[PDB]
A paper describes a structure:
However, recent high throughput sequencing analyses identified a high incidence of somatic mutations of critical histone lysines into methionine (K-to-M) in multiple cancers. Other histone K-to-M mutations also dominantly block the methylation of their corresponding lysine residues, suggesting a similar mechanism of function. Moreover, we determined a high-resolution crystal structure of [name] in complex with an H3K9 methyltransferase [name] and SAM, which provides a detailed mechanism for the role of methionine in trapping histone methyltransferases.
To understand the molecular details for the interactions between [name] and its methyltransferases, we determined a 1.7 Å resolution crystal structure of [name] [name] domain in complex with an [name] peptide (ARTKQTARMSTGGKA) and SAM. While the dimethylated Lys side chain assumes a fully extended conformation, there is a sharp bend at the sulfur atom of methionine, such that its end methyl group is in closer contact with Tyr1067 and the sulfur is in closer contact with Phe1152 and Tyr1154. The methionine side chain does not extend as deeply into the pocket, and the SAM compound at the bottom of the pocket moves closer to the side chain, by ~0.8 Å compared to the position of SAH in GLP1. Interestingly, the methyl group of SAM is 3.4 Å away from the side chain of Tyr1154, which is part of the conformational change to stabilize the peptide-binding pocket.
Residue numbers in the entry:
A (entry chain P): 3 to 11
B (entry chain A): 920 to 1090, 1095 to 1187
């Protein structure tokens, strides 16, 4: 879980 | 009718025009178009040419003798530079292209992403998803489209960026933020029924902290179709609490109804 949204492969 | 003839201002192999048939909004200019990743703080990428694994091929690198193909598991490109049908579009392998240490020529079969954009794309205004990118030509399955290009930042820096609409995780993990510096890929929307996939690729360096993100078509794409990939749950776990998916697929995983249903 991170603070910001991340796109990913 | 055309607003900008090329939002890339000649930086790509082909132009990328911009149109807006929806409203009077000008094509976006609140970012800097760059064609290769940039740094706004020291990244310390390992660029040592002697650290490259490389092949000793005397041919076009289509044989079992190619180390680079083996690093990739196999060379996944066919004679036309498209991914083999056998390519795993669900869980893509790491691709190691040939590089400046290889004995092969620059036109060997294992250098697709490093040769850049070849297909005709258009930046356009969508109905419900802001700006998006669509095809101006037929794009066969397995074709390289474009790279996700932006500002290289640390995981920690990424977690404190105010705008998290353009963050792409590369994996001490790093991230590409295309908010302030980016290419055409920054405008590619999310689709729950996607027609492109991102793939991690190594070219002129093999620093594993810094894969480059290459988009390939995962099926045939027809002229006029919007390009989109599955942004993934590390995007939607957060974003679904602020807005809902407008892709309109009957398979949509992040729609208002899908989100309400899961919350209930
Ligand atoms: C990488 S940007 C894509 C380009 C963006 N549409 C623009 O105009 O700059 C991602 C943002 O586009 C919007 N977006 C992309 N896909 C969407 C979708 N399927 N449904 C709703 N909004 C979407 C969201 O604001 C998301 O944070
Ligand atoms: Zn080779
Ligand atoms: Zn090689
Ligand atoms: Zn080669
Ligand atoms: Zn959807």
């Amino acid at each position: 879980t991170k603070q910001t949204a991340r796109m990913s492969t | 009718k055309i607003i900008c003839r090329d939002v890339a201002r000649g930086y790509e192999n082909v132009p990328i025009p911009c149109v807006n048939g929806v409203d009077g909004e000008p094509c976006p200019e609140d970012y800097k178009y760059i064609s290769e990743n940039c740094e706004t703080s020291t990244m310390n990428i390992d660029r040592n040419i002697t650290h490259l694994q490389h092949c000793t091929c005397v041919d076009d690198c289509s044989s079992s003798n190619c180390l680079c193909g083996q690093l990739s598991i196999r060379c996944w490109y066919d004679k036309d530079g498209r991914l083999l049908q056998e390519f795993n579009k669900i869980e893509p392998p790491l691709i190691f292209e040939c590089n400046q240490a290889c004995s092969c020529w620059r036109n060997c079969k294992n250098r697709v992403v490093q040769s850049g954009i070849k297909v005709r794309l258009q930046l356009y205004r969508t109905a419900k998803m802001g700006w998006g990118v669509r095809a101006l030509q037929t794009i066969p399955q397995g074709t390289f489209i474009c790279e996700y290009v932006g500002e290289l930042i640390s995981d920690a820096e990424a977690d404190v960026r105010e705008d998290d609409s353009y963050l792409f995780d590369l994996d001490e993990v790093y991230c590409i933020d295309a908010r302030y510096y980016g290419n055409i890929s920054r405008f590619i929307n999310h689709l729950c029924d996607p027609n492109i996939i991102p793939v991690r690729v190594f070219m002129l360096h093999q620093d594993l902290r810094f894969p480059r993100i290459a988009f390939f078509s995962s099926r045939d794409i027809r002229t006029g179709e919007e390009l989109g990939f599955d942004y993934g749950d590390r995007f939607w776990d957060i974003k679904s609490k602020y807005f809902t998916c407008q892709c309109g697929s009957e398979k949509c995983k992040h729609s208002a109804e899908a989100i309400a249903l899961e919350q209930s």
